[PDB]
Amino acid sequence: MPLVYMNIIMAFAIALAGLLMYRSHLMSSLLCLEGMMLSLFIMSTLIILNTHFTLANMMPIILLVFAACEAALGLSLLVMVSNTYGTDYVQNLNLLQC
Amino acid sequence: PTIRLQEDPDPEDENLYEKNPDSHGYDKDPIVDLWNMRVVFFFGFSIVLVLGSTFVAYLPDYRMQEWARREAERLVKYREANGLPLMESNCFDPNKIQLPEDED
Amino acid sequence: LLDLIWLETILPKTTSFIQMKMSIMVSNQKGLIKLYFLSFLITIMISMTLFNYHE
Amino acid sequence: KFYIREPPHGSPDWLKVGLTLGTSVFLWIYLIKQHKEDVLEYKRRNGLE
Amino acid sequence: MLKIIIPTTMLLPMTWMSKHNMIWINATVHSLLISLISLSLLNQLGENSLNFSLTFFSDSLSAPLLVLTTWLLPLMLMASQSHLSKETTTRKKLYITMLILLQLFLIMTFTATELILFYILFEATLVPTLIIITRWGNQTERLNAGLYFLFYTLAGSLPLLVALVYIQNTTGSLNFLIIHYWSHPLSNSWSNIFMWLACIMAFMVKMPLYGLHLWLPKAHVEAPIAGSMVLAAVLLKLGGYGMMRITTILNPLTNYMAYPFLMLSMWGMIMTSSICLRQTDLKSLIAYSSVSHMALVIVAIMIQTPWSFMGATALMIAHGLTSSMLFCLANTNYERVHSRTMILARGLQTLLPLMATWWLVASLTNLALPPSINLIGELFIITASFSWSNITIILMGMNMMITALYSLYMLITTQRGKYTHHINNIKPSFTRENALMALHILPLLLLTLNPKMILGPLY
Amino acid sequence: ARQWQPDVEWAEQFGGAVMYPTKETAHWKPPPWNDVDPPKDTLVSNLTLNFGPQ
Amino acid sequence: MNPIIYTTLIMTVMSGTMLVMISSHWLLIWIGFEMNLLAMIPVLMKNFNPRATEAATKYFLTQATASMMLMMAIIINLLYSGQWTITKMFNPVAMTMMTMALAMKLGLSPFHFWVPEVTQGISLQAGLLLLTWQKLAPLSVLCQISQSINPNLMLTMAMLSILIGGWGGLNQTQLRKIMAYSSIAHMGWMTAVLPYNTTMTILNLLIYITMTLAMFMLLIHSSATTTLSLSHTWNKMPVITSLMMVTLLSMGGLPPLSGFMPKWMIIQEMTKNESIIMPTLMAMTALLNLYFYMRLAYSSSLTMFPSTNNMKMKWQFEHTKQMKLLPTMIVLSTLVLPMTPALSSLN
Amino acid sequence: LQYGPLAFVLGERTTRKLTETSKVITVDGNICSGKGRLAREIAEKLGLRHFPEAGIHYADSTTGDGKPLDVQLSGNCSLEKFYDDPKSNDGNSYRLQSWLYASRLLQYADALEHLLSTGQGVVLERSIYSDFVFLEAMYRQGFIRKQCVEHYNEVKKVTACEYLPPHVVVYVDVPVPEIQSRIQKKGNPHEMKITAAYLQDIENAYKKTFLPEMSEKCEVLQYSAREAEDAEKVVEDIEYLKCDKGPWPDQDDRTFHRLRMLVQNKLEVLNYTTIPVYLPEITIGAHQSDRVFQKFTELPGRKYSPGYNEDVGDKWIWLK
Amino acid sequence: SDAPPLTLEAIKDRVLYVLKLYDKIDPEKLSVNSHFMKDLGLDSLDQVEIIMAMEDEFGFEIPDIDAEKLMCPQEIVDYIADKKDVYE
Numbered sequence A: 001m002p003l004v005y006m007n008i009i010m011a012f013a014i015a016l017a018g019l020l021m022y023r024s025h026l027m028s029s030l031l032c033l034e035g036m037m038l039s040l041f042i043m044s045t046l047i048i049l050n051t052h053f054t055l056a057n058m059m060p061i062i063l064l065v066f067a068a069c070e071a072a073l074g075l076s077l078l079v080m081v082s083n084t085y086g087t088d089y090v091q092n093l094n095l096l097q098c
Numbered sequence B: 001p002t003i004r005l006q007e008d009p010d011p012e013d014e015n016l017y018e019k020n021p022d023s024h025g026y027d028k029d030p031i032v033d034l035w036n037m038r039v040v041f042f043f044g045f046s047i048v049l050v051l052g053s054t055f056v057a058y059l060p061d062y063r064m065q066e067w068a069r070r071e072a073e074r075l076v077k078y079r080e081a082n083g084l085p086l087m088e089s090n091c092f093d094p095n096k097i098q099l100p101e102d103e104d
Numbered sequence C: 001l002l003d004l005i006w007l008e009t010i011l012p013k014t015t016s017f018i019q020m021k022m023s024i025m026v027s028n029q030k031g032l033i034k035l036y037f038l039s040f041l042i043t044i045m046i047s048m049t050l051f052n053y054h055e
Numbered sequence D: 001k002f003y004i005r006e007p008p009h010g011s012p013d014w015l016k017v018g019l020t021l022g023t024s025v026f027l028w029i030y031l032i033k034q035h036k037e038d039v040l041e042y043k044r045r046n047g048l049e
Numbered sequence E: 001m002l003k004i005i006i007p008t009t010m011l012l013p014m015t016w017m018s019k020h021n022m023i024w025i026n027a028t029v030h031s032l033l034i035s036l037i038s039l040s041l042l043n044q045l046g047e048n049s050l051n052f053s054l055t056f057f058s059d060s061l062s063a064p065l066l067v068l069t070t071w072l073l074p075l076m077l078m079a080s081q082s083h084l085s086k087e088t089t090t091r092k093k094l095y096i097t098m099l100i101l102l103q104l105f106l107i108m109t110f111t112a113t114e115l116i117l118f119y120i121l122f123e124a125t126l127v128p129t130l131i132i133i134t135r136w137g138n139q140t141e142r143l144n145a146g147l148y149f150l151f152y153t154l155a156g157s158l159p160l161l162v163a164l165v166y167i168q169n170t171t172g173s174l175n176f177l178i179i180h181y182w183s184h185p186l187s188n189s190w191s192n193i194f195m196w197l198a199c200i201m202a203f204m205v206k207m208p209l210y211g212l213h214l215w216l217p218k219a220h221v222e223a224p225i226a227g228s229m230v231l232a233a234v235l236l237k238l239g240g241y242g243m244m245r246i247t248t249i250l251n252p253l254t255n256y257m258a259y260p261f262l263m264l265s266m267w268g269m270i271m272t273s274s275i276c277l278r279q280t281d282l283k284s285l286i287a288y289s290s291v292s293h294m295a296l297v298i299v300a301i302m303i304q305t306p307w308s309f310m311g312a313t314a315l316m317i318a319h320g321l322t323s324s325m326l327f328c329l330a331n332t333n334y335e336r337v338h339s340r341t342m343i344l345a346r347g348l349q350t351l352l353p354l355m356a357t358w359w360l361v362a363s364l365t366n367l368a369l370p371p372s373i374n375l376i377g378e379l380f381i382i383t384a385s386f387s388w389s390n391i392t393i394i395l396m397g398m399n400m401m402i403t404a405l406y407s408l409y410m411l412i413t414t415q416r417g418k419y420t421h422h423i424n425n426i427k428p429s430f431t432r433e434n435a436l437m438a439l440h441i442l443p444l445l446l447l448t449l450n451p452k453m454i455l456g457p458l459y
Numbered sequence F: 001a002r003q004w005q006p007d008v009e010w011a012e013q014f015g016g017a018v019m020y021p022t023k024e025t026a027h028w029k030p031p032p033w034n035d036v037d038p039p040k041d042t043l044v045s046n047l048t049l050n051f052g053p054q
Numbered sequence G: 001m002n003p004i005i006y007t008t009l010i011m012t013v014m015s016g017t018m019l020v021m022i023s024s025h026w027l028l029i030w031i032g033f034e035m036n037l038l039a040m041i042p043v044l045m046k047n048f049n050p051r052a053t054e055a056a057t058k059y060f061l062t063q064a065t066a067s068m069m070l071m072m073a074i075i076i077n078l079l080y081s082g083q084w085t086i087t088k089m090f091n092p093v094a095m096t097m098m099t100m101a102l103a104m105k106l107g108l109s110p111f112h113f114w115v116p117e118v119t120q121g122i123s124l125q126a127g128l129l130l131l132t133w134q135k136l137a138p139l140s141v142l143c144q145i146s147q148s149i150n151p152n153l154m155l156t157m158a159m160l161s162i163l164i165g166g167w168g169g170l171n172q173t174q175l176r177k178i179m180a181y182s183s184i185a186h187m188g189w190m191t192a193v194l195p196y197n198t199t200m201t202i203l204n205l206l207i208y209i210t211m212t213l214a215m216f217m218l219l220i221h222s223s224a225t226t227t228l229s230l231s232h233t234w235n236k237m238p239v240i241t242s243l244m245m246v247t248l249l250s251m252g253g254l255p256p257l258s259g260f261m262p263k264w265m266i267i268q269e270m271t272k273n274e275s276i277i278m279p280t281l282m283a284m285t286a287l288l289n290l291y292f293y294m295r296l297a298y299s300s301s302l303t304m305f306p307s308t309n310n311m312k313m314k315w316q317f318e319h320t321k322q323m324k325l326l327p328t329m330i331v332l333s334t335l336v337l338p339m340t341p342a343l344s345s346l347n
Numbered sequence H: 001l002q003y004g005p006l007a008f009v010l011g012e013r014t015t016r017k018l019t020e021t022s023k024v025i026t027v028d029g030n031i032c033s034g035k036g037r038l039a040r041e042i043a044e045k046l047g048l049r050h051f052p053e054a055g056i057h058y059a060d061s062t063t064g065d066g067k068p069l070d071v072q073l074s075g076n077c078s079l080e081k082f083y084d085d086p087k088s089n090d091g092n093s094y095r096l097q098s099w100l101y102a103s104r105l106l107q108y109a110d111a112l113e114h115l116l117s118t119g120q121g122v123v124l125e126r127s128i129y130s131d132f133v134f135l136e137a138m139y140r141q142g143f144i145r146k147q148c149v150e151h152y153n154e155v156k157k158v159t160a161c162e163y164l165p166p167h168v169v170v171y172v173d174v175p176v177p178e179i180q181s182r183i184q185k186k187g188n189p190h191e192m193k194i195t196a197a198y199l200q201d202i203e204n205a206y207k208k209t210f211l212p213e214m215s216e217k218c219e220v221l222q223y224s225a226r227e228a229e230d231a232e233k234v235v236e237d238i239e240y241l242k243c244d245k246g247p248w249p250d251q252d253d254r255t256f257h258r259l260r261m262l263v264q265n266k267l268e269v270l271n272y273t274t275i276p277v278y279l280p281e282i283t284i285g286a287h288q289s290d291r292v293f294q295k296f297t298e299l300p301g302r303k304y305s306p307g308y309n310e311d312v313g314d315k316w317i318w319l320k
Numbered sequence I: 001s002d003a004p005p006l007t008l009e010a011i012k013d014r015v016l017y018v019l020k021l022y023d024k025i026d027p028e029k030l031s032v033n034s035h036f037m038k039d040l041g042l043d044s045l046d047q048v049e050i051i052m053a054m055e056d057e058f059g060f061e062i063p064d065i066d067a068e069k070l071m072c073p074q075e076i077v078d079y080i081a082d083k084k085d086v087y088e
């Protein structure tokens, strides 16, 4: 693979790692989710352009659509959590245990 | 209330002899109890015990004890007269056995 | 000494003690997504190297 | 006797009862017919009779 | 042999369709008739077994066990109807349903031609027993007793399942006739050693082997009387039956894998007999008696001789009858005085003479007075062990002396002495209890009259 | 004279949030009877603004 | 919530699952997962309260992470072989990531923390849906790529799931958490036999779904979510407690009940390979699930717990809503072992 | 057809049946005051359905036949012995209070179901919102413990929050000495032992908690004793209320759908009354529970479901 | 687990520490029986500050009545114990 492929894969890994380790704000983790979506878009677009697969040029648009759906879902859940606690801290979501 | 719960008291045990001086210990109802006694006695002692013991005593000899005794008598008679040994150490004829060629 | 104590001690009481201790260890989590998402990260990293690097 | 309607009345719901019985009889006759045709087809294919 | 299976399955709806006041009568009558029908299975051959179908067969080892099961059902019914008088009709029918299901599973277990079917039935016998113990027991220890009974059994039985499916994948069949005819020796390897252990430990825990028996005093003391009867008389013999069946494929590995179990059996026989000498609970004494007798049965099965197999069969039948009778005898006193402590009610021979006679006969058969079948089995096993090694007579000899001691200790403590002054509610013996004791004891002596019916296939 | 049945003391073993309580989980509370926690008074302060004089 | 909207959301959940099950393109499978999650999130919050909101948030975060890893694995597979068809998965790193993503979606151990929490935070109907219908899509995808699967990772996660399910279930008094740990252990059993025979996976899935439906419907019938509230059901409907006791016995795996059949067949299949140690450990561990099922049976059916005065008023009224499939579910959960050879129709 | 989601999907809507006379009315007052007569007159004048005050055997009146059952199988508490021995060591007081709260909850559910099904108004004597005055009077007099009060508060918190409060609250005010005079004039030998402090506690609870907190949900119509016999004046006073302040105007079709699904299914209504809080006053042992349940199942029309008891003359059972 | 089971002794050491942290009281002259008004020469306003310091230290509020009558450290310790139901 070229260097650009490794760079995009590294960006995906960094965004995943970012999502895995929570600080305080929920919104930061949502941003990491969007970052993973962007990295996947870039990687798929590069692969499809390189191989000249004409009918596959439309998949990244579908990916963006479902990324938007996912982001809207997350934002709605954040609105509800904030309305409950007045803060979007993940520390407050501790009513249910294992 | 200094209590912990609402519960019935533990009742005393009933004596079946109080309402039925000849009670047989099967039921509180005298008629049902008497017939329970009767069916238990008839179907346990009269039917299963005695008749089953007779049936087992007169079972036909499927174990073939007497057949084996008569066969052994025939064999002993035949072998004694001929001068043959009463019994043989090998129960299988060696002509039908093939030992391995080499023992070294 | 034997029937009421040691035969009890070795087979059933040891089993009960071990199962209860492991149940306490496994089931007592605070329910904070931070901790077990960090656990997920550790699992993912171990998995690529331990089982993925060897194909 | 009852304080209220208790909608299932002394007579049974005749529509539901008829539908249930009709479904049962239809399924039974369908199964009998299917088994008969299956036997005939099996006998024809292997040439028993 | 559906002519026996189907009538029990008919006992089920007969019980559930009977009037509220005729359930005991109907169940008892038809159980006795089913026992009479099963009596026909004693007509066995000298060379092979009765092969009814592809699924069921009857040997000379399982026919007396089936007869014992079918005979034990009516006795349990008579023993249960006293303390279940205040119970509702539905719960009484459920109790009878549990007993009938247990009999059906036991009947199918002793005649299954395959080992996996035998496993499924021998494991299905657990659910009715556990339900009976944990639902109709008297004290709060019954829950723990049920847990002990369940897990001790399953922890032994699951490796047996693994070993059985492995054996079927290896040899292509689990049918017992094919297994016997196509038998091949077991080599000396760790895989074979663990296969032996997996095939043996479930039956060992069922006997139960000394050191693996802790479940038995709990389960047999905390159960209701019918539960105790069927646990001591039939359910312990599943281990012996299964072990004599499975040992066909374990040779010649048994020749040395039997040593730890033999030492455990002999020494723990001595230990359990000694434990019987200092026991405050009358039922626990009978339970530990069962453990000692079953240790003898384990020794007989492990040394693998025709005389030991004959002795094992005879001892299993005799012990079933004797231990069931002893449990019923103890339950009579418990129902009178509501306590299991042995030294509470004393001098009972003065108050209940005929029950004292029943006690004497039961404790005489427990110590194996000749020519009872108890002694026939014990003596055959002792002779086989002596041929195995001349030093076993010492351990065997000690056991005989100890068994007599604790049996007569039980008799003298309960029947002789002076009656306790404060207990004034000792009513005369009912006809039902006397009939129960007679139906226990008369078949024992009748079988003594014709002992080849309980001596197994090696006869 | 009668079969033993569980009482209040026996029944209270199963009334906690967890079995086998420890020092850490002895302060865990069982969920409310309906799954509705009481609402917190997380008051959101309104914004205060100077409209004038300039 | 409007009944029409609820029905539309349920059909969208099922449409996402069916799209996963009928697609040949990896993109369509990923789309099915996205649609399923999008429709599932509001169903968890149907009865709005902070616990339901927390459960929905945790579920969304876990499943969104899982779908992100799923898409990355698909893209890596495309990079190393320009194939979109769901097949043997020509790349090993992509297969490892795919396995981890599907395990996260199913709730297999190590990623099993979310299941007890989401199940306890939602209603019994939402729990029924989550623990029955939501297993179909990841299991179907796993079945379609079973040949390229690495046994060492899948078997490790399956054994960990069985162990953790038993140990976690041992400690619970809440019925929903008990169900969740039971689900974790059964998922472990399902995935243990997947590399060897997918028919056994399907059979175990069907039997587990039947038993779970029966248990959840019995719990909804007698409105109990805690052990102590279930201990009152004997004084109101004893038949329900008896049927629940028999179903709990079936869940434990005791013969001659139907629950025993999947474990039996999986053990046989694993011994048809070499694989001797793993089934032995799996059975020994399932004994723990049997233990806490038996404890529940002790508390609800085999002993009678004290009741309250106000139960007398409840005695006068009947259950209005009736579940039409509950008797069939109970019968299928209990008395189906003699029909075992019918599993041949599954392949 | 049984009301449910299918009935709501096509057709049935509650908001159309409300015809300006829905107006859930409750007429509160102290002991022996003539609140029942006023409630009956209000119902007759306005054309609403009258609900007499729920007693110990209210639930019996609505299931099976309307005839009451034995107190052992229903209630398990006595009003008379509460007056005779208010400090009995068997928990009669709080058991009676808890049973009466459950009966009031059932009656409120019945009234709400009738109103939401027909659109017709209902008049109640007391409500679940008023039941606490008797509990406070018992606690201040030392007739019940504090744990009983905590249990009552838990049950009320999880039950009374799911319904809509009454549109208008009518209160009849009668002074305590006049109440004692009326009780003496009545003749019942058990009510004579009611101390004046008990009535004073009931009045304080009413006027200092119930009316203040109820006035925020909707305006309260108070009346002295003399201006309560004139029923037409009270009714015409009710007809000129501006009711746009409470939760009732903010109810749309879906909330009414949820409430209508809740008011039927009385098992769902009574769910939280039997919570496993083990108070000695209301906890019943397993043996007694089993005995009483077996006794109840043997009643002539109680073993099976309503239409399936052939021992009270149910026919065609084997086709139902 | 939560905080240890606070006892009378620890309450006394905390009260005495807070009191000697007050710049208007000399440490050596202060005892658990010293009276703020006479022994320590403290005015009514000073007492209010001491009570507020106790409030901060023990994390709970003392009403105007109640707190007003505590004139020496022993009464403060007794009040804190009675409010916290501490017997040891």
Ligand SMILES: CCCCCCCCCCCCCCCCC[C@@H](O)O[C@H](CO[C@H](O)CCCCCCCCCCCCCCC)COP(=O)(O)OCC[N+](C)(C)C
Pocket: B048, B049, B052, B053, B054, B056, B057, B058, E039, E064, E065, E067, E068, E071, E317, E443, E446, E447, E449, E450, E454
């Ligand atoms: C209360 C008062 C008591 C004392 C008074 C009693 C008066 C005297 C009566 C006592 C009788 C004395 C016994 C002496 C023995 C005589 C009987 C003997 O000769 O019969 C035996 C026969 O006995 C029977 O075979 C044994 C009975 C079978 C026992 C089965 C029990 C029935 C089932 C009950 C339930 C099963 C539970 C146990 C499960 C295994 C001989 O066997 P066999 O050598 O062949 O016969 C040769 C000739 N044949 C073959 C042509 C017949």
Ligand SMILES: CCCCCCCCCCCCCCCCC[C@@H](O)O[C@H](CO[C@H](O)CCCCCCCCCCCCCCC)COP(=O)(O)OCC[N+](C)(C)C
Pocket: E188, E189, E190, E193, E210, E211, E212, E257, E260, E261
């Ligand atoms: C409390 C009651 C429980 C029930 C009792 C169950 C009884 C189980 C006992 C098992 C009997 C024998 C098992 C194995 C057979 C031989 C044992 C071994 O010690 O013998 C030597 C084995 O040598 C050494 O001992 C090696 C084994 C050492 C490791 C074993 C661990 C034993 C420690 C005790 C742990 C307790 C076990 C029971 C747990 C409760 C023989 O030498 P070798 O010829 O080379 O091995 C024969 C096999 N070959 C032919 C394939 C080579």
Ligand SMILES: CCCCCCCCCCCC(=O)SCCNC(=O)CCNC(=O)[C@H](O)C(C)(C)COP(=O)(O)O
Pocket: I043, I044, I045
């Ligand atoms: C940051 C800068 C802000 C500063 C601005 C603060 C504004 C100050 C507001 C002033 C309020 C008053 O005058 S309030 C009125 C004050 N005067 C009285 O109360 C008359 C009786 N005097 C006394 O009781 C004692 O002298 C007394 C000193 C009180 C001790 O009290 P004790 O004997 O009981 O200890």
Ligand SMILES: Nc1ncnc2c1ncn2[C@@H]1O[C@H](COP(=O)(O)OP(=O)(O)O)[C@@H](O)[C@H]1O
Pocket: H030, H031, H032, H033, H034, H035, H036, H053, H097, H100, H131, H134, H191
């Ligand atoms: N919730 C309650 N708690 C205790 N006693 C009550 C309760 N409700 C009614 N009562 C009693 O019922 C009796 C009459 O009830 P009431 O409605 O006030 O008189 P009336 O029959 O004229 O309407 C009184 O003795 C009253 O104390």
